[PDB]
């Protein structure tokens, strides 16, 4: 068939977010609705289900490369730290939000903790990712 690399990723993360909407058992934390996702961000996100979209993005990043822990997730979710009157720099994201994403993906079997540190992606998660890759391929065809 196809893989996720033949699939356009921008609608693919939304499709896996819709898949998590269909599943609905990720056991979201209580402080999801009110928290700001980073020290360098300013506002809360405009979308009400940013947790599912970021878990979709976490799933496809762990599919592309495994063994990515909390520091690597803050590295991929870092950005500009607008210091106001001072020049901007790079700032990593929040640790606990990606920690809860990995706890949800360890709760329902999409990732697994690997030796020598980090999270790898399980063959069940690879199965679901290639199924939704075929879904987005059949949608765009």
């Amino acid at each position: 068939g196809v893989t996720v690399k033949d699939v356009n990723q921008q609608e693919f993360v939304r499709a896996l977010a819709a898949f998590l909407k269909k599943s609905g058992k990720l056991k979201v934390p209580e402080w999801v609705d009110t928290v700001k996702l980073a020290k360098h961000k300013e506002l809360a996100p405009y979308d009400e289900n940013w947790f599912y979209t970021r878990a979709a993005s976490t799933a496809r990043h762990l599919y592309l490369r495994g063994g990515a822990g909390v520091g690597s997730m803050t590295k991929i979710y870092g950005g500009r730290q607008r210091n106001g009157v001072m020049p901007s720099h790079f700032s990593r994201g929040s640790k606990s939000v990606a920690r809860r994403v990995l706890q949800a993906l360890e709760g329902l079997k999409m990732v697994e903790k690997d030796q020598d540190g980090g999270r790898k992606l399980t063959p069940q998660g690879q199965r679901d990712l290639d199924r939704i890759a075929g879904q987005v391929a059949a949608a765009k065809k």
């Binding site: 893989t3 690399k5 033949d6 699939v7 356009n8 990723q9």
Partner: protein
């Protein structure tokens, strides 16, 4: 039977892209994904340029796999742009006749020198007493 493996590098300012041609079907992919999804998408026809110039008949028998490291976005795009064309020219030089290789080389040269010859321009070193290479800080009289 015999492996027609051709490994050809292509260089921008810092980005290096090594294309790999074999005997196979007409598929071209870079870092495990084809040319249709390489962001930014404004340089999609720039990636399609050797296919549009040479037709699908030349690329039908050649499969190209490219490993890329270094540079930026436009640097990697122009690196794979140069590398797949140089890899096809080296493949058609080694395994088929030199006349079609010379014709394809003429077609590439009459379009752009960047498709074959790499640009030797690299970043000039910053000097002391300036924010950049040639520019100096603002001299203050009085």
């Amino acid at each position: 039977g015999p492996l027609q493996s051709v490994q050809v590098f292509g260089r921008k300012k810092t980005a290096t892209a090594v294309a790999h041609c074999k005997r196979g079907n007409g598929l071209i992919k870079v870092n495990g994904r084809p040319l249709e999804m390489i962001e930014p998408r404004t340089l999609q026809y720039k990636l399609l340029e050797p296919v549009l110039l040479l037709g699908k008949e030349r690329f039908a028998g050649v499969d190209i796999r490219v490993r890329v490291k270094g540079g930026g976005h436009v640097a990697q795009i122009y690196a794979i742009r140069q590398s797949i064309s140089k890899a096809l020219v080296a493949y058609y030089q080694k395994y088929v006749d030199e006349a079609s290789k010379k014709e394809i080389k003429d077609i590439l040269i009459q379009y752009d020198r960047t498709l074959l010859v790499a640009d030797p321009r690299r970043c000039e070193s910053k000097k002391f007493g300036g924010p950049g290479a040639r520019a100096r800080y603002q001299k203050s009289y009085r």
